[PDB]
Every structure is written in C-alpha cells, then in structure tokens.
Amino acid sequence: EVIDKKAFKDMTRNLYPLNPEQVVKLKQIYETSEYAKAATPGTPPKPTATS
Amino acid sequence: QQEIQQRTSDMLTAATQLVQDWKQVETQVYTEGT
Amino acid sequence: QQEIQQRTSDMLTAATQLVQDWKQVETQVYTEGT
Amino acid sequence: RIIYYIQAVIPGRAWLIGSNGSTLTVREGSKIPGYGMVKLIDSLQGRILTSSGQVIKFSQEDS
Amino acid sequence: RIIYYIQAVIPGRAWLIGSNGSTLTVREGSKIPGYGMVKLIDSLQGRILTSSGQVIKFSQEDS
Amino acid sequence: RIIYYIQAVIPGRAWLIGSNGSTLTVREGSKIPGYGMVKLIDSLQGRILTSSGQVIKFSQEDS
Amino acid sequence: RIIYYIQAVIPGRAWLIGSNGSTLTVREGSKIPGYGMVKLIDSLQGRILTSSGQVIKFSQEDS
C-alpha cells in the first residue's frame, strides 16, 4: 500500500511538472519580456497641434 | 522496485482519461413558441 | 543528472504551451436586433 | 496650491492633470510650474521626482 | 457607522458594499471609513483585515 | 416553534424545509435559528448535526 | 532680439523659425544675425552652435 501511495505521489509529479509559484513567476517573466519588446527607446515625441 | 512504474503506467493514463472530462462544457439551448 | 535535463524538457514543453496560451486573445462580438 | 496627478504613465513622457484640472505632458528633463524642474520620471510605481524632491503621484482614489 | 460586506473576492482588487448599499471597489492599500486602511487582502476564504484589526466578511446568510 | 426537515442533500450545501414555508440552503458554518450552528454535514444517510446536539433528518414517510 | 527655434533637425541642414513667424534653413557655412556664424552643426539632440557661443534648440513648449 505504501508503494501505491508513493506511486500516487510520483504520478502527480509526472502529471504536473509545474508549481503554481513557478507558473506565477514565469507569467511575470513573460510580462516583463513583453514590456521589453514593447519598449520604445529614447524620448518619445509630444503630441501637439501646429497652426 | 520494479513493479512501481508499470503500476503508474495505467494510472497515469487513467488520470489523463480523467483530466479532459472537465474541460468540455455543453452550452445552452433555447426554444420558442406561439 | 539526466533527470535534470528530462525535467527541463517536459517543463519547457509545458511552458511553451503556456506562453502560446498567454499570447492569443480573441476578439469581441457586436449584436443588435430591431 | 496646485497638485498634479499623473494621468498616463509612460516611459519617457508623462501626462498629468492638475487639482484645477489643467492638463499637460512632460519629458524627463524639463520644467514644471509649481515644482520648478523635473528630476526623475520612471514607470516603476508611478513616481515623479520633482526639483523640489517631491514625489508626484496620481489621484489617491483613482486607483 | 456603515457595516461593509464583501461582494467580489479576487487577487488584486476587491468589491464591497456598505450597510446602506454603498457600492465601492478597493485596491490592496487604501483608506476606508470606520476601519482605518486596508492592510491585508486574503483571496483565500474571503476575509479582509484592516489596519484597525477589524474584519470585513460576507453576510451571515449570504456567505 | 418551527420544525424542519432535510429536503435535498449535496456535498457542500444543504437544503432544509420547515412547515411554515421556511425553505433555505445552509453551509457547514451556518446559523440556524432555534437550533444554533451545524457541526457536521454528511452527504449520505440523511443526518444533519447541530451544535446544540439536535439531529435534522428527512421526513420518514416522505422518503 | 529675434528669438529663433527649431521646427526640424536633420543632418546636412537646419530648420529655424523666428519668434515673429519668419523661418529659414541654414547650412554649416553661413551667418545668422544675433548669433553670428554657424561654427558647427550637431545633428544629434537638435542643437545648433554658432560663433557667439549660442545654441539654438527646440522650444521649451515644443518639447
């Protein structure tokens, strides 16, 4: 029966190789990488009208 | 030692059988009349 | 330490699936009737 | 006096409304009436460092 | 004063109504009347602990 | 006073009906007036246990 | 005296507009009244150096 219990443990680990903490951290990593992708270098221009 | 993994073989498929049973959800239906 | 690279491989497959799940966002709908 | 709230946090520039409702936009190194010059602008946590050493934020309830 | 209930419990934001029906939404750090400021939001089990040590929960019947 | 019975039992939520039209749903931590609090809910065999020691049960002929 | 400001900055030439509404373009070897002769042209950052130690840049408002 203890073999069955540790089997439940390792099959749970094999079904889900991800901790939710790891999920949240990699989601933050994705958001920061997307922010770096969408980052505009230098000073942006100011929107204004000319007459 | 050697019986452990083949014990987990069918069980992992059984969970994989179980894991998609909650994914699908049927939508509503609607009927009218007069 | 083959368990390290195997774990990295399966977690990488799951993570690539996760980020292509994060990427897509569907559009809206607009419905009227009169 | 006059208090400015950052209305569009962006890298580089900054859009602000006042306590009077006066709208403006600035860059990193520039001048601001009511605070003099500008010292530091970052998109991290919405802080504007004025020349008076003060931290301009947005409105408190607009959070 | 006003007794506040919890309407929507999520990470990040929270939605509350008062005893009089006063609907509102809060962030993690903000001031509320009668309880001080909100110092902790627990997404698990739906309790809010204020700076005064007071608890915001749901209704007893509508829990 | 009012006498209740169990009506519909699911795991998690319970449904009770009194003869005076008082039919509601209750949780494990729930204030039942005239009885107190629920201390145990079993999904099978139809017994609901009160913190005052009362046992809420189905109707034996409506069974 | 007449206040000049930059409406466009390129390598090669420079584009100046006076405070009265009079605008022109300039090269490296040329003169401007009130600033003298253009000793050097900085295509970076919109800065124009002259002989009188004076730099024409954009307006404070056009920033």
In total, the C-beta contacts within 8 angstroms joining chain D to chain G are 4
Q: Hey, how many other C-beta atoms are within 10 angstroms of the C-beta on F12?
A: 9
Q: Is residue F25 within 8 Å of residue F38, measured between CB atoms?
A: no
Q: Is residue D35 within 8 Å of residue D51, measured between CB atoms?
A: yes
Question: Chain A partners of B15 at a C-beta cutoff of 8 Å?
Answer: 11, 15
Give E59→chain D minimum CA distance, Å.
26
What are the contacts of C11-18 at 24+ separation with CB within 8 A?
A: C11/A17, C11/A18, C14/A17, C14/A18, C15/A18, C15/A26, C18/A23, C18/A26
The amino acid sitting at A5 is K
The resolution of the experimental structure, rounded to one decimal in Å, is: 4.6
* Gap between the Cα atoms of D63 and D6, Å rounded: 12
Q: Scan residues 1-30 of B and list those with Cβ closer than 8 Å to A.
A: 3-4, 7-8, 11-12, 15-16, 19
SS3 G29: coil
Q: Is C13 exposed, middle or buried (0-12, 13-18, 19+ CB in 10 A)?
A: exposed
Phi then psi for residue F38, to 5 deg, are -80, 135
Give B25→chain A minimum CA distance, Å.
22
Our CA angle for C21, E14, E20, nearest 5°, is: 145
Largest CA distance in chain B: 70
Q: Is residue A15 within 8 Å of residue B15, measured between CB atoms?
A: yes
